[PDB]
UniProtKB/Swiss-Prot annotation, chain A:
In the N-terminal section; belongs to the ATPase B chain family. In the C-terminal section; belongs to the ATPase delta chain family. Binds 2-aminothiazole antibiotics, which are antitubercular agents. This is ATP synthase subunit b-delta. The chain crosses the membrane at residues 3-23. The chain holds residues 1 to 50 of 445 of the full protein. F(1)F(0) ATP synthase produces ATP from ADP in the presence of a proton or sodium gradient. F-type ATPases consist of two structural domains, F(1) containing the extramembraneous catalytic core and F(0) containing the membrane proton channel, linked together by a central stalk and a peripheral stalk. During catalysis, ATP synthesis in the catalytic domain of F(1) is coupled via a rotary mechanism of the central stalk subunits to proton translocation. This fusion protein includes a component of the F(0) channel (subunit b) and of the F(1) subunit (subunit delta). Two copies of subunit b and one of delta together form the peripheral 'stator' stalk which links F(1) to F(0). It is found in: Cell membrane. F-type ATPases have 2 components, F(1) - the catalytic core - and F(0) - the membrane proton channel. F(1) has five subunits: alpha(3), beta(3), gamma(1), delta(1), epsilon(1). F(0) has three main subunits: a(1), b(2) and c(10-14). The alpha and beta chains form an alternating ring which encloses part of the gamma chain. F(1) is attached to F(0) by a central stalk formed by the gamma and epsilon chains, while a peripheral stalk is formed by the delta and b chains. The lineage of its organism: Bacteria, Bacillati, Actinomycetota, Actinomycetes, Mycobacteriales.
UniProtKB/Swiss-Prot annotation, chain B:
The gene is atpF. F-type ATPases have 2 components, F(1) - the catalytic core - and F(0) - the membrane proton channel. F(1) has five subunits: alpha(3), beta(3), gamma(1), delta(1), epsilon(1). F(0) has three main subunits: a(1), b(2) and c(10-14). The alpha and beta chains form an alternating ring which encloses part of the gamma chain. F(1) is attached to F(0) by a central stalk formed by the gamma and epsilon chains, while a peripheral stalk is formed by the delta and b chains. Belongs to the ATPase B chain family. This is ATP synthase subunit b. It comes from Mycolicibacterium smegmatis (strain ATCC 700084 / mc(2)155) (Mycobacterium smegmatis). F(1)F(0) ATP synthase produces ATP from ADP in the presence of a proton or sodium gradient. F-type ATPases consist of two structural domains, F(1) containing the extramembraneous catalytic core and F(0) containing the membrane proton channel, linked together by a central stalk and a peripheral stalk. During catalysis, ATP synthesis in the catalytic domain of F(1) is coupled via a rotary mechanism of the central stalk subunits to proton translocation. The chain holds residues 61 to 120 of 170 of the full protein. It is found in: Cell membrane.
Length: 50, 60
């Protein structure tokens, strides 16, 4: 019970730290890769058009 | 990766294709100029021959 509540608070703190600091950069890297592939496909389409 | 390589190859091939289409344009321009110059040259040469033989006939 009490140890369960303490562990739950610890997990909440861990999740808050992750979402606050590590989630933004991983999301940014994901978006960067998405934009890179989008640009590659757009450039392929532009090369076909040319 | 194949699409990336094909896009690069397409860019290079289209660049050289526009270059070669232009080069063909000047090449056929020069070709037409050469044939026009020929036509004129052989026409005037035949005229020279005809006028020379007419001069010979007149002299005789």
């Amino acid at each position: 019970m009490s140890i369960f509540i303490g562990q739950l608070i610890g997990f909440a703190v861990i999740a808050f730290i992750i979402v606050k600091w590590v989630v933004p950069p991983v999301r940014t890297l994901m978006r960067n890769q998405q934009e890179a592939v989008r640009a590659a496909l757009a450039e392929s389409a532009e090369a076909a058009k040319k | 990766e194949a699409m990336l390589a094909k896009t690069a190859a397409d860019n290079r091939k289209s660049a050289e294709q526009v270059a070669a289409a232009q080069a063909d344009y000047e090449k056929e321009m020069a070709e037409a100029r050469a044939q026009a110059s020929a036509l004129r040259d052989e026409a005037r040469a035949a005229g020279r021959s005809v006028v020379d033989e007419k001069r010979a006939q007149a002299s005789g």
